[PDB]
Structures are given as C-alpha cells and as structure tokens.
Amino acid sequence: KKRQWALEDFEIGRPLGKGKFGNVYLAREKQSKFILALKVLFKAQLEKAGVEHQLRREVEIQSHLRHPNILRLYGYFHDATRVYLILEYAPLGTVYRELQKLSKFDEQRTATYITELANALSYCHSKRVIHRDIKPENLLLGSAGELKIADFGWSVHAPSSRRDTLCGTLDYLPPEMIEGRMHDEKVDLWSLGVLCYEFLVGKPPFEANTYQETYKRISRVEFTFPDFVTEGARDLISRLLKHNPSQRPMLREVLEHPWITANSSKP
Numbered sequence: 001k002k003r004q005w006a007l008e009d010f011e012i013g014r015p016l017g018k019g020k021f022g023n024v025y026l027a028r029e030k031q032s033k034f035i036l037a038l039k040v041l042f043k044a045q046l047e048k049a050g051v052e053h054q055l056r057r058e059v060e061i062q063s064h065l066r067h068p069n070i071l072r073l074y075g076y077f078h079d080a081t082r083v084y085l086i087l088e089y090a091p092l093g094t095v096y097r098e099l100q101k102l103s104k105f106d107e108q109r110t111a112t113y114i115t116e117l118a119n120a121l122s123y124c125h126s127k128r129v130i131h132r133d134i135k136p137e138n139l140l141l142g143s144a145g146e147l148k149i150a151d152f153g154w155s156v157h158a159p160s161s162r163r164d165t166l167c168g169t170l171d172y173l174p175p176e177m178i179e180g181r182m183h184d185e186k187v188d189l190w191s192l193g194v195l196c197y198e199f200l201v202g203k204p205p206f207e208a209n210t211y212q213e214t215y216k217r218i219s220r221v222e223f224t225f226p227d228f229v230t231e232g233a234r235d236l237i238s239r240l241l242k243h244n245p246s247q248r249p250m251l252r253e254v255l256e257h258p259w260i261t262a263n264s265s266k267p
C-alpha cells in the first residue's frame, strides 16, 4: 500500500507451516494489535532456486486481488537475510488437514468448496490470471469455514508458454502442462476436476507410486470411480477432466451444474 513495514513492527507467534523456502507464522502488528500471517522466505534459497522472479509474480498478482475467496496479501518487506510477505490469516487451517482429519467429504461440503473455488477462479480468470497450483494444501479456511485460495506462487497470466521445471506432484496438473505445451485458464478447470474427485474419494484420481507412472495416468486420462460416487459427481468430474482444454466447461457451467446446485449450500 502506502506504507513500509519492518520486522520490528510485528510480534511473531506459533508457526503455522514449514515450507521448502520458509515458514509461515502467526503474527500481530504491534500498534494496531492486528492479527495476520507472516510468510518468511530466504533470499539464500530463493536465489539458489532461481524463483525470485516467480516470487515477484506471486506478490504482484496476489497483492492486486480482492475477493472473499482469495487470501489477501497486504504487502511485504526484506532485510539482509530473508523476505517477509504479510498475509491475511485464515484461522481454520488448510483444506488438506480437513481432508486428513475427515478422510472424505460429503457431496455437500464438496459442492460448497467447489462453488467457492469456482467463484474465486472466476474472479481470477476475468483478469487473465491462471493459478496452476490448485491443490488442497494451497487451500485455506476462513473464520466461517469458507474456502480461500492462498499461495499464488505458480500463478501467471494467460496464455502461458511456460515450461517451468515441474517441482512437486503432477497430481493436479493437466496434460498440456506436464507435457510442456502452452496453456490457458482451462488449466484451473482440470484442476477443479481433480480437486472435486479428491474431496469425495480421499485421493486424487491419478495417484501412482512414481512420477513417471502418474504422468502416464494424466496423459492418458486414466481414472475410475469408487462405487459410492453418485452419477452426478461422476458427470461433473468427467466433464472437467478432458484432454482437450476447450472441451472442458466454463466456471459458469460448473456453478450451474445440477449436482452442484442440488448440493452446494453457497451461491
């Protein structure tokens, strides 16, 4: 914003998470008593990994996004050693931990998460921003249990040519991305299909024991449903996981989906 913060402005609390490049802490701003989360990253690690520009990309995009379903970035600042991102704080945790805890979601919590998500993504895409990292570990919970997309680390503007050496799990990545081609916002809808399935089933539909094998699964779009996935969930997920991006529906079609409406508690 208009202001320049510094570490001495904040009391750091209990650590929320420990990433590869740094950790997230609860923290309070001394003068306002304001509660939020401080993301501490290391110039050393960011440098060695050559992500500095991608970090820039994160800060710009996220800082400029306002939406109930997106985690706000208020600002940032650096010192000799590390980099500090000042983030809105989501008091109920990741969707990942919800999923470990419950191991499966009912159609209603899933349709709801999928709705909030679709809305969020909608807002993003209207700006030509594609997230590309949508996974439950990157999804957080607000005071009211409402879903918030955090961690804009891999997002970019569309279309993208990006071949970025793929670091983590392919589990949420569409064929066009793993295969090194150019991609557009449809990426996120593929991901939404992956997410939907993981929410209902407890594991992402392409899970394998090796990168190479999972990569095969995604490329050939090989998945199957447990018997307890209702036909409506199957239809939404099947429409969402299409080798052809242009065959994948649009967030309007998702929000307007019969299964979504018969289930979601949130418009």
Ligand SMILES: O=C(O)c1ccc(Nc2nccc(Nc3ccccc3)n2)cc1
Residues within 6 Å of the ligand: 016, 017, 018, 024, 037, 087, 088, 089, 090, 091, 092, 093, 094, 097, 137, 140, 150
């Ligand atoms: O008690 C926990 O588990 C937990 C509690 C709150 C929380 N909220 C939060 N808010 C803003 C950013 C952020 N980053 C983050 C993302 C994933 C894991 C850890 C931190 N987390 C995360 C975890």
